[PDB]
Design a binder for this molecule. Structure first.
Ligand SMILES: Nc1ncnc2c1ncn2[C@@H]1O[C@H](COP(=O)(O)OP(=O)(O)NP(=O)(O)O)[C@@H](O)[C@H]1O
Ligand SMILES: Nc1ncnc2c1ncn2[C@@H]1O[C@H](COP(=O)(O)OP(=O)(O)NP(=O)(O)O)[C@@H](O)[C@H]1O
Ligand SMILES: [Mg+2]
Ligand SMILES: [Mg+2]
Ligand SMILES: [Mg+2]
Ligand SMILES: [Mg+2]
Lengths: 587, 587
């Protein structure tokens, strides 16, 4: 393991959790699989990288590479084995899962084309030192007949999907694989009632679970004997979409922070602009968790919003639903969010956070278990926490430093508070924060914006959590399959489709108005944000399944998929009071 | 309060320490703990993401006409208003003091934190060294008198002079012209020493390996008349320092702009394959440049810069040591060696480079490069590094796997090259990634097989080829039109250049090779042969060196870690300075 075997062109080493391979703070892969080599190769040689993928064969489905130096997105065309499009050096070559590559699939780099052969460089095929100075691992027979190009693999039971090239030229290239509507259908299921949820099924021995009870009782939803399922094909679409939209959202965030006209649309205090930028530039890789809201049904997959600032439901999807399973599911399926705690613990272990982080939650019994759920992650990652319930335990020394109750310094914190809240305190000649007070009255903004404090999630995360970014995403990725047309007005095309009126910095499902392509108000909610800037997002009603509208939620943990959860409501607009609906992935 | 003790915070949480006798924030140099400039610059960066260049004295800030936006190396305009100006001294502006009274010769600077119609509050660092009133975010209050539109401030001191304030804005109304220096101060004068035989035998100490290195190459000699020297006024040096820091920031801005636009970068004739790396380099090794050298024409007419040797520059030993020996040996006046601390500031930039513990020095087998290697070896040694000089490439070879190793078999991972990158680029002009060897029968390692090895960390960084290439001159002209120090440089002989006459110069040449100086009369004032005849030329406005005491003197300033590192001369019987032109003692 790890023995250096040789080098691909340009001098890219080839070898045979704590195996994460990074070059700077860019994730190359897992040591030392086929994907890690192809990614690193592309990263050291062309400054580009493809998004996270579970299996190597999932690569052949991407249609874009990211250019790191400027978070720019480039077009990547795919080509089937046997194409007029010739397989040039440096192109990605992918294998479907099958034979030698049972389930994984495979990927390598074409280092050199010939007249009757081709040389590829790759990892996890060869585990022996290569001959002095030879920069390739295998050769593959190529058949050039009638302008068409075919590659023949050295194995006898492996399908080669094709090669890929980063180019605008779409000629000879195939279309982006589109998933079957049926495979995306959500459908109800039921457990056999043997009184499995008739009592204290939630383990009250566990402090975390018990905190949940204190805030919600022994309840997940009205009927715990009923649950829903999604095909394992859907979860994969969910993983494709989550990872892909995650990059999109950042590509737009960077785009926003690069032009005062675009940033100006978010109504953030103009005094926080330079700080937004600086935060983006040095904490771009420090985001920890996020939740994406989707509509999923036979029509396809659409994104409503990306709660990137401060999300929740982690405890529910990643702990309670597990208990529910362990308590009453005897099937073969699985909870798409089972390993959320670890995913998070992972993200924390690699976050440049201080050894001792203060957890800042509000004095709401409902946040208690959320703060503790996260504290579990931080503790699993080896950090020291101290859960601050409200701003009362906070104070300043004589000089002006932030100390907690025990009297220690507060320089690193993970908040439950949304940044827009601290923003509010500003909207009343440079970030006005107190550094001392006769009564020691410390405020939220007096902590989160104290330059010396390391906050999670980062400041810039409020750009992607703000809806003013949706119209921008549309502008940059027009007619993208997961996107919904949204604008800061009701344009001609929207007036025609119907739309959702939404406050740019709202949440909980507040002040949302749903108008049809007719005139009628399909549904409306109240809220505290009825006075802020609204956006209008193309309508796209939630699917009703077994008497409840259902919205799919995935989580992002450090940029990548972290799980899926369900949310149901008797009405079209999911709200804070909505129920969590058990979900079980099936194949 | 002792040194380093925190007394309080300015607006936004910018701490104020007691400087009762160097600070960085990430990778950005802020100042020296804890001067008035260290706080002034830190305030701006933490609050506004901008910063102003390295200044010798705080009073010099008032002469600066631009700020730097760090998050994108963009340059912002900064106007200066006299104290007594219609322009009101808004909060956040810079308040600069001229040297005098309480602020003797250092001068002084502070930040206006708030206005009160009849008063103003400011924060600073090297004025009061005692804790401040719990919570008070200012250090002093000045009386602002407003009489008929004008604004005047009165400083709490009776003998000091307040220059005015500065505001980053495009509105030049009420503002001051960027001062110019009286050409008479920029004149280079000839001087002579009393001949009492100070330079007749062996004045260079041969027991010092360094000096001996110099002598084995040049003998006990610097120029043809060691008794004659030149002088410039301390004001000209200040100007020279002013210009060096300014141009350095300019070139770096021009580099950023080039690596952000393919249509520009393409004018450099750098093998495409390297583009992604050029970019990656600018991004990581942004602050890793050690030392460069600028070439100027200075005289009553003012200051012009011909080129900026940022890749590989020499003359460091001559200026910072041999001339030191010359003075210590035959000078007894009051003037000084403008380059005396090179070695010390050199060790400086190394100590703060992200350099690896053992650094291989790579020179070419030139009895002349030996002392430039060894001189640099001293700074490395002083900054605490282990070195081994490599003369030529015979000593290099590869392991069985393909790793670069030196004579004594150790790994070559870090390197300070004497070689010019273009030499390595040339080995590319003769694939699907940079064509380097990671193995070879005869174990024959080329230059490029080292500099472009991904694991090999080199100095100077790859990107420096850009500023070092003269295709940047036209770009620089384009960005900073009729700039005080720039010369009209284009890629063709445009109308204007026909009028002035111009220099024909290869974009990637050195030593003064293949230069053609044509007059407005359209005559060839001078020519030089060379090995760069066949590459792309740029044409720069003629601006002949001045002739002083029989020779033409060109001024040179060293850049070191981005800031002025000293000055030296070079004279020649011709208008063209070459590798053979001698160094002339400056004082
Ligand atoms: N374009 C749309 N078409 C149909 N329904 C929509 C649309 N946008 C939103 N909704 C519904 O409105 C709810 C609220 O919209 P959403 O974009 O999630 O805003 P939010 O208040 O920021 N969410 P959250 O932070 O989870 O509480 C969703 O959960 C959907 O059920
Ligand atoms: N615009 C100009 N007008 C008049 N003389 C010039 C001009 N540009 C250059 N020269 C002269 O030509 C010499 C060579 O030009 P320079 O720009 O230093 O090129 P170089 O060969 O890259 N320098 P170097 O790397 O130090 O050896 C200068 O030192 C001057 O003596
Ligand atoms: Mg939502
Ligand atoms: Mg939301
Ligand atoms: Mg020169
Ligand atoms: Mg040069």
């Amino acid at each position: 393991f790890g023995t250096l075997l040789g080098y691909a062109p340009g001098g890219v080493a080839i070898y045979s959790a704590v195996f994460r391979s990074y070059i700077d703070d860019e994730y190359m892969g897992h040591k030392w699989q086929c994907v890690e080599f192809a990614r690193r190769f592309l990263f050291l040689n062309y400054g580009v990288v493809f998004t996270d993928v579970g299996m190597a064969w999932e690569i052949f489905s991407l249609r874009f590479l990211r250019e790191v130096v400027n978070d720019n997105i480039l077009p990547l065309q795919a080509f089937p084995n046997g194409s007029p499009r010739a397989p040039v050096a440096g192109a990605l070559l992918i294998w479907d899962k099958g034979g030698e590559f049972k389930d994984t699939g495979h990927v390598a780099i074409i280092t050199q084309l010939h007249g009757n052969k081709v040389r590829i460089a790759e990892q996890n095929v060869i585990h022996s030192p290569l001959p002095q100075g030879q920069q390739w691992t295998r050769e593959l027979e190529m058949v050039v007949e009638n302008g068409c190009y075919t590659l023949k693999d050295t194995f006898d039971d492996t399908t080669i999907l094709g090669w890929m090239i980063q180019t605008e030229d779409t000629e000879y290239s195939l279309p982006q694989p589109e998933i079957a509507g049926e495979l995306l259908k959500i459908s109800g299921a039921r457990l056999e009632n043997k009184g499995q949820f008739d009592g204290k099924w939630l383990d009250e021995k566990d402090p975390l679970q018990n905190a949940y009870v204190q805030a919600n009782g022994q309840v997940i939803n009205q009927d715990p004997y009923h649950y829903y399922t999604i095909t394992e094909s859907a979860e994969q679409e969910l993983i494709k979409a989550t990872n892909e939209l995650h990059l999109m959202y950042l590509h737009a965030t960077d785009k926003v922070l690069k032009d005062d006209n675009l940033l100006a649309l978010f109504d953030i205090p103009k005094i926080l602009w330079p700080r937004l930028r600086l935060s983006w530039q040095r904490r771009r890789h420090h985001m920890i968790t996020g939740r994406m809201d989707f509509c999923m049904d036979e029509r396809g997959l659409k994104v409503y919003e990306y709660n990137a600032d401060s999300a929740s439901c982690h405890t529910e999807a990643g702990l309670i639903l597990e208990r529910w399973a362990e308590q009453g599911y005897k099937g073969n399926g699985f909870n798409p969010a089972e390993g959320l705690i670890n995913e998070l613990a992972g993200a924390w272990k690699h976050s440049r956070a201080r050894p001792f982080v203060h957890i800042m939650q509000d004095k709401d019994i409902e946040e208690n278990y959320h703060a503790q759920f996260m504290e579990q992650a931080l503790h699993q990652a080896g950090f020291e926490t101290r859960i601050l319930r409200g701003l009362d335990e906070l104070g300043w020394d004589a000089a002006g430093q932030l100390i907690d109750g025990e009297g220690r310094l507060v320089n690193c914190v993970w908040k439950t508070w949304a940044w827009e809240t601290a923003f509010d305190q500003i909207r009343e000649a440079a970030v006005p924060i107190r550094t001392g007070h006769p009564q020691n009255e410390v405020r939220l903004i007096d902590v989160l914006l104290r330059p010396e404090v390391l906050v999670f999630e980062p400041l810039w995360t409020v750009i992607p959590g703000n809806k003013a970014i949706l119209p921008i995403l549309w502008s940059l990725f027009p007619h993208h399959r997961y996107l919904l047309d949204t604008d800061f007005t009701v344009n001609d095309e929207l007036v025609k489709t119907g739309y959702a009126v939404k406050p740019i910095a709202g949440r909980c499902g507040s002040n949302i108005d749903l108008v049809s392509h007719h005139e009628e108000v399909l549904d409306k909610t109240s809220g505290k944000f009825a006075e802020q800037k609204n956006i209008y997002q193309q309508l796209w009603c939630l699917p009703k399944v077994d008497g409840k509208y259902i919205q799919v939620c995935t989580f992002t943990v450090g940029g990548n998929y972290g799980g899926t959860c369900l949310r149901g409501d008797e009405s079209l607009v999911i709200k804070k009071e909505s129920d969590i609906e058990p979900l079980i992935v099936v194949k």
